[PDB]
Write an enzyme that holds these catalytic residues in place. Sequence first.
Site, PDB file in Angstrom:
ATOM      1  N   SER A   1       0.879  -1.139  -0.144  1.00  0.00           N
ATOM      2  CA  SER A   1      -0.043  -0.014  -0.027  1.00  0.00           C
ATOM      3  C   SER A   1       0.823   1.522  -0.192  1.00  0.00           C
ATOM      4  O   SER A   1       1.938   1.008   0.450  1.00  0.00           O
ATOM      5  CB  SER A   1      -0.717   0.137   1.147  1.00  0.00           C
ATOM      6  OG  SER A   1      -1.681   1.263   1.381  1.00  0.00           O
TER       7      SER A   1
ATOM      8  N   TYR B   1      -2.068  -0.570  10.459  1.00  0.00           N
ATOM      9  CA  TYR B   1      -2.139  -0.875   9.000  1.00  0.00           C
ATOM     10  C   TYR B   1      -0.788  -0.342   8.382  1.00  0.00           C
ATOM     11  O   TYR B   1      -0.214  -1.125   7.533  1.00  0.00           O
ATOM     12  CB  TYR B   1      -3.267  -0.298   8.430  1.00  0.00           C
ATOM     13  CG  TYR B   1      -3.410  -0.539   6.775  1.00  0.00           C
ATOM     14  CD1 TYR B   1      -3.008   0.713   6.071  1.00  0.00           C
ATOM     15  CD2 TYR B   1      -4.114  -1.424   6.289  1.00  0.00           C
ATOM     16  CE1 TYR B   1      -3.287   0.324   4.730  1.00  0.00           C
ATOM     17  CE2 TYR B   1      -4.257  -1.625   4.941  1.00  0.00           C
ATOM     18  CZ  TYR B   1      -3.919  -0.730   4.337  1.00  0.00           C
ATOM     19  OH  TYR B   1      -3.986  -0.819   2.976  1.00  0.00           O
TER      20      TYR B   1
END
Lengths: 260, 260, 260, 260
Positions: C142, C155
């Site tokens: 990501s 995350y």
Amino acid sequence: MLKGKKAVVTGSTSGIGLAMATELAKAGADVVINGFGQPEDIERERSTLESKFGVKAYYLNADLSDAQATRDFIAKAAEALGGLDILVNNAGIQHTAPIEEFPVDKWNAIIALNLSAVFHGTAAALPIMQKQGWGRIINIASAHGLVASVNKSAYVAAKHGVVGLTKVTALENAGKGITCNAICPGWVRTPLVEKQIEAISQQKGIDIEAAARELLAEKQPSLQFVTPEQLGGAAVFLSSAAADQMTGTTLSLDGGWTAR
Amino acid sequence: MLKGKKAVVTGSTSGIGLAMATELAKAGADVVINGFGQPEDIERERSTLESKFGVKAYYLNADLSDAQATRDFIAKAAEALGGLDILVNNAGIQHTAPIEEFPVDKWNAIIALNLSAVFHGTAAALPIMQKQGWGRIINIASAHGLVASVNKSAYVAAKHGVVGLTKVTALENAGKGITCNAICPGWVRTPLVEKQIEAISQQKGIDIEAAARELLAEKQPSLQFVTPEQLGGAAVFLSSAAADQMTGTTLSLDGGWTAR
Amino acid sequence: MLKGKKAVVTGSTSGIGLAMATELAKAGADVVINGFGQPEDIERERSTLESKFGVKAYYLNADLSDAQATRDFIAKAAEALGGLDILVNNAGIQHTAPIEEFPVDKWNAIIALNLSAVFHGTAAALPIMQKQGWGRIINIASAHGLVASVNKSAYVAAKHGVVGLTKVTALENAGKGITCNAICPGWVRTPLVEKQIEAISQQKGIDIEAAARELLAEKQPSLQFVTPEQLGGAAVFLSSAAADQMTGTTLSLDGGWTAR
Amino acid sequence: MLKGKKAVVTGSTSGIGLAMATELAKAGADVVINGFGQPEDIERERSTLESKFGVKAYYLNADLSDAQATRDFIAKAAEALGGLDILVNNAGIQHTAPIEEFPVDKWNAIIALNLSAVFHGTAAALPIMQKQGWGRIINIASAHGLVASVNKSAYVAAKHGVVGLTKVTALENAGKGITCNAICPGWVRTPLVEKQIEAISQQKGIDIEAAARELLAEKQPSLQFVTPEQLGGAAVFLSSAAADQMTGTTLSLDGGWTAR
Ligand SMILES: [Ca+2]
Ligand SMILES: [Ca+2]
Ligand SMILES: [Cl-]
Ligand SMILES: [Cl-]
Ligand SMILES: [Cl-]
Ligand SMILES: [Cl-]
């Protein structure tokens, strides 16, 4: 000078950790050492901080691989100090092996102490800093929090996690007088690194230094080790007023490691 | 802490270049200041560095825009000071315009002063430092040394060159006691920025300080400018013994700019 | 195409997961989907992969939050595919909250699936691919594996950890014919994200699409969403031979997110 | 896949630049080659592409070290092409030497060509792409655009400038259907390279393959050169609707170079 400051360093009973605890104290801050080790050593070093730097130096035990234990550990820490201005997250463990051969049990312990411990610790230190208007979360990753090396999957991942975690800590507190950075070390003449040096020395029939430079050649262009006094200094700097606007970034002391 | 050190700072007659010189002078180094200006103000700024820190300060005018002129310039400084220990490559200009509207004139100027002057100045001072066995090359780059921003092709490309160039300098001198690092500042409250704050303060019908926050919001999450005193501070630290193994990397004082 | 390749994909019953599987399959490879879902739809999705592209499609369930579960999983994957060339670790979950208010359940649950499942899943495929002589491990990281954002400690920690693990994997299998790269996406218009288009839409009084841009403006310069298909293409790309020497690096499709 | 597209590659009468013009041609796009060489050689290549891919190929001789000249060169390229969809800036030159010895001629010549050219070439192709609503700028940098090596100051600087310049270009045009990324290759068995490999070959008495693995082992883990075709496949992929949301980023092909 960090006079009046209240510092806390995890896994600080020797080597890297004990080095920063030393320089923070030398800078005038009261400290809290932590970590497992032969008890007399612990007390002896904790005592030697008090006497040699004229500051308060407490010792609080805690096995950081445990979420809750670490969260209370900082609470006690802060109570022993009557505050908490600086928190140094150092605790760490290592293990070499190819992915396919890396012990799941090993993978969890490194992630838990190297990565998790940083989270729980910060999570507990922040509220105290946010309410003070000043803080400093300094995480001790490594050049491996920036690039990788063969067979160090767990450690590199964790270290890369810490760097990212450092960036969210910084953004979540931007402008509140709190900064968070990570000091990414290169090679350090650590006791067992000292054993790796001897091995290559007597195994090749060379002096200790030539052997030393031999182990450093693949990564540290300077072929010179980073010293504990230097690591301590970096920490003391980040804690300086001049580092008021430095936040969310890394500080690399790797004698050239990442430059290439 | 830098007593007896001889430092040269380019573009040091005001702003960031002035504070860094002041800070090193406060650390004890003798400093050679350079930059454009009304001779009454140069002599003033030079005079106080002297009377305030009891060090020796000399001013050397030079057109850093010409390869040759900048080399004899350092040669001149080395001589004035009687050596050369620390070089801060600061000078530089900015021009904002879309890529396909960027004046080749502006492009060539941004690169000549912001990038090339670095190289010519590094190359001329490097021999002095290599013979001494100790040195400090400090390039004053920017967040734009690490990332981009719309309409700054020349500055971003020039700043990235400096970061690249700083890495080559550090690797070429690894272990020789000569380190090269690049400080990368974010928004700095310059006089031209004051007008910009002033203009937006009246435009949005809000107070001056509220306009400052508004201006830094898109790039600097701390909503606070990095002060010049802070960059001099970072320069000092880099010139310290605690940074002997910090070479070929970046020091980012950008309020979080690059963390996100 | 990738005729005869045997690609596996986690979290692929829907979302980007299904997309990549579709592209890899669209290119002639036999795939294996894996994820939560109603036995109807899932089957309907597998079955259609088999008719739509003329290849073999298998479905395998597994609780990737469990080492043994995920390890036994890729094993079944192979046994079903009769080999294993392309492995894709996609699974992952989110949770937003300031660090100090982040539930430990969420931090552990995110680290274990988003990061730890990468380790184990990789560790079980390597041997297969190692004896073969050809491998392709694609980790869906990501933009948040290179930079951070507020309230995303876990995350972001996990995604940075995957970048590192990616490098280590690639380095550990250098020249063996196996490569490991991490694709780093920016915002993808997921039905979840759609709920954010609407709140921002109703809150400011702007039409839905103007709100789509207002959502992306903060991080994605192109004001355009990355699509699941585009990612799939990138996956097929990394599986081709042109990418034979691209290993341990990142492939960012973020519309300029990491560029500034 | 790129049927009907108009692509231009600078410095592509041979080597890496040629491989790309070739793969793009195979993609279906007409192309404009350029560079150095004999009229008979150039024509031979221009000839084949055209007659071996069902594409129209044109050749233009332009000296890209001259600002106004490269601006005319792309003008004429779009003229002969009937438009401009893809511009691949590839022309470059090198020079090895320590910084204090690096020839000013050399430094200025590297910057003008390796960096300044990429600026002018982009400034003149953009307007055409802005009007079209679609475009592809693919700069060919190198791993030296991300990291450094000893004695390559001008090159590593210029390359870093490119990468930075690549970011600006993307942020300035994000959303317009135009993208700018930089291909960063590692070791490629280039002419200039090949002799370094034969130099050490008979300097240790080992056959090429071994004296070559020497050159490789220091920076490229996979011990395999990056082939020109592979780089072509990359440019082709950057021109695909798959990377429509891939912009302002770097695409590394370096056998694990930047991985560690
Ligand atoms: Ca590196
Ligand atoms: Ca960024
Ligand atoms: Cl390694
Ligand atoms: Cl911008
Ligand atoms: Cl944010
Ligand atoms: Cl090198």
